[PDB]
């Protein structure tokens, strides 16, 4: 099975998965000065059901189709007709040691790539929301655990707004290059950070349980108290 890692899965809730993966690898590699072979495995947009191996090679991101076949009872994965594996893992593992022979030349995949855009499609994430604008949304939700994550004007920084003990409370998150810091705490990306506190307590044992948005209000939201 796949447990995140280079495995990003669905990108953009099924929308513009290739494009989203190109900007995710470009700006990431250009900055971090990534070596050739940097990659991620995403769901295929063109061939529904199959996968795609997207990677960085000479200032350019290229995609490779990962065929899948579930006929022999056991799933099968391959990039070529002469080599097959029982899992994406054994397949990715393999092409890390052994190169990729194509028309141009060969290439061994080097290092994974984190999910830096994963939050841009999530329900709780907002790109342009004022604090009051956010407080007003959480004001219409008379509960504890409801939350959201807005991006602030200040470069590389996001706030986490939530309802603790029946009262609005906010939290500061700061982007440090390619890692997110929640005060002293450090994570790989917003989605890895929210994922964590969706289980663990974020404040007084208050955990992020109820993402909030327009439709989320159509399910809970009334008119706002104060």
């Amino acid at each position: 099975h796949s447990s995140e890692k280079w495995f990003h899965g669905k990108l953009g809730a099924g929308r513009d998965g290739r494009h989203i993966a190109e900007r995710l690898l470009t700006e990431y590699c250009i900055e971090t000065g990534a070596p050739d072979g940097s990659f991620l495995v995403r769901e295929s947009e063109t061939f529904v059901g199959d996968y795609t191996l997207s990677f960085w090679r000479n200032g350019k991101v290229q995609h490779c189709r990962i065929h899948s076949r579930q006929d022999a009872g056991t799933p099968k994965f391959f990039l070529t007709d002469n080599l097959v594996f029982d899992s994406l893992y054994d397949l990715i593992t393999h092409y890390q040691q052994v190169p990729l022979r194509c028309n141009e030349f060969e290439m061994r995949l080097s290092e994974p790539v984190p999910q830096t855009n994963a939050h841009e499609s999530k329900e709780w994430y907002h790109a342009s929301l004022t604090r009051a604008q956010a407080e007003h949304m959480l004001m219409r939700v008379p509960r504890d655990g409801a939350f959201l994550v807005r991006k602030r004007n200040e470069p590389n920084s996001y706030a986490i707004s939530f309802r603790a003990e029946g009262k609005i409370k906010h939290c500061r998150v700061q982007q440090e290059g390619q890692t997110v810091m929640l005060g002293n705490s450090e994570f790989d990306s917003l989605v890895d950070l929210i994922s964590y506190y969706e289980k663990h307590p974020l404040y007084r044992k208050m955990k992020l349980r109820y993402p909030i948005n327009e439709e989320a209000l159509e399910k809970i939201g009334t008119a706002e108290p104060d």
Binding site: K10, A13, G14, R18, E45, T46, F47, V48, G49, T52, Q62, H63, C64, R65, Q70, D71, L79, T80, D81, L100, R101, C102, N103
Partner: protein, 307 residues
């Protein structure tokens, strides 16, 4: 009360019924909420669809629904097949609980994506972003081929492949549904209808129509008709032709015409599926592979060629 199944049986009270989603002569599907479908998540509510018999259902219909439920357990999970979630078989009405397809059946999906026409515009000018492209249409045919291919590898014939039986999910994934007429032919390699009854004639192959002979070959015929349905964006097969005359038309080598705005290869694909010699029609493995190539070629998205 019939053989319960601890594997699928779900407490009848952990299911909250909602509004209708579609009906027929004797059968109905209704939206519902399933509490704690997964044992590790006893309080997580999952939107689902529940299939059940109508008020005027007969003994016969019940056995058909039992069968339908058994078929889905024997076929297994697949990306393009609606997956079975569970059932309520004891002390009350039989409920077959299945995955919920938020965009309905393919026929409806396609029609709601049809153009306005020249000099005409839509009101209230609905989502212009969901208007399907030629790439999206091939992708739908491909997905259904992949699901049928898997079904054939499981030695099963659907016998009721039609756009009304292909469901579309939230992210636009095709899900083959309605296995009430499906049959297992693991060793025999064919099914011969003994009794009589209701049948989707406009989708049935000659031999299944006159000789009552069903195989993967007749499913492929139905798939030819499905293709026509897709490329006409929800048209009706053999429009205006009375069923009683359909018999005469088929016996004389009549095939439907090419849907406007449809390459010749895709029309040729339909023709192959409608071949008079069953053994000459493509199998689903050939349809997936052909459709694979067309999808790769229609979507001008370049990939690494490793050969």
């Amino acid at each position: 009360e019939l053989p319960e199944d601890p594997r699928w049986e779900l407490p009848r009270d952990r299911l909250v019924l909602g509004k209708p989603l579609g009906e027929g002569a004797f059968g109905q599907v209704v939206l519902a909420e399933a509490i704690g479908l997964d044992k590790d998540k006893p309080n997580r509510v999952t939107k689902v669809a529940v299939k059940m018999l109508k008020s005027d259902a007969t003994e016969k219909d019940l056995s058909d629904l039992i069968s339908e439920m058994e078929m889905m357990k024997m076929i297994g999970k697949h990306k393009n097949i609606i997956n079975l979630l569970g059932a309520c078989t004891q002390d009350g009405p039989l409920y077959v609980i299945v995955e919920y397809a938020s965009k309905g059946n393919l026929r409806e999906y396609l029609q709601a994506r049809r153009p306005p026409g020249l000099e005409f515009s839509f009101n209230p000018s609905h989502n212009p972003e969901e208007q399907l492209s030629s790439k999206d249409l091939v992708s739908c045919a491909y997905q259904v081929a992949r699901g049928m291919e898997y079904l054939a590898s499981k030695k099963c014939i659907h016998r009721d492949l039609a756009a009304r039986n292909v469901l579309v999910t939230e992210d636009n994934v095709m899900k083959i549904a309605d296995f009430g007429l499906a049959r297992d032919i693991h060793h025999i390699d064919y099914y011969k209808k003994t009794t009589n009854g209701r049948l989707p004639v406009k989708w049935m192959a000659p031999e299944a129509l006159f000789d009552r002979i069903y195989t993967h070959q007749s499913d492929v015929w139905s798939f030819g008709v499905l293709l026509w349905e897709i490329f006409t964006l929800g048209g009706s097969p053999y429009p205006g032709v009375p069923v009683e005359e359909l018999f005469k038309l088929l016996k004389e080598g009549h095939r439907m015409d090419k849907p406007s705005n449809c390459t010749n290869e895709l029309y040729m694909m339909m023709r192959d599926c409608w071949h008079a010699v069953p053994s000459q029609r493509p199998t689903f493995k050939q349809l997936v592979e052909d459709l694979d190539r067309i999808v790769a070629l229609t979507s001008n998205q370049e990939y690494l060629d490793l050969s």
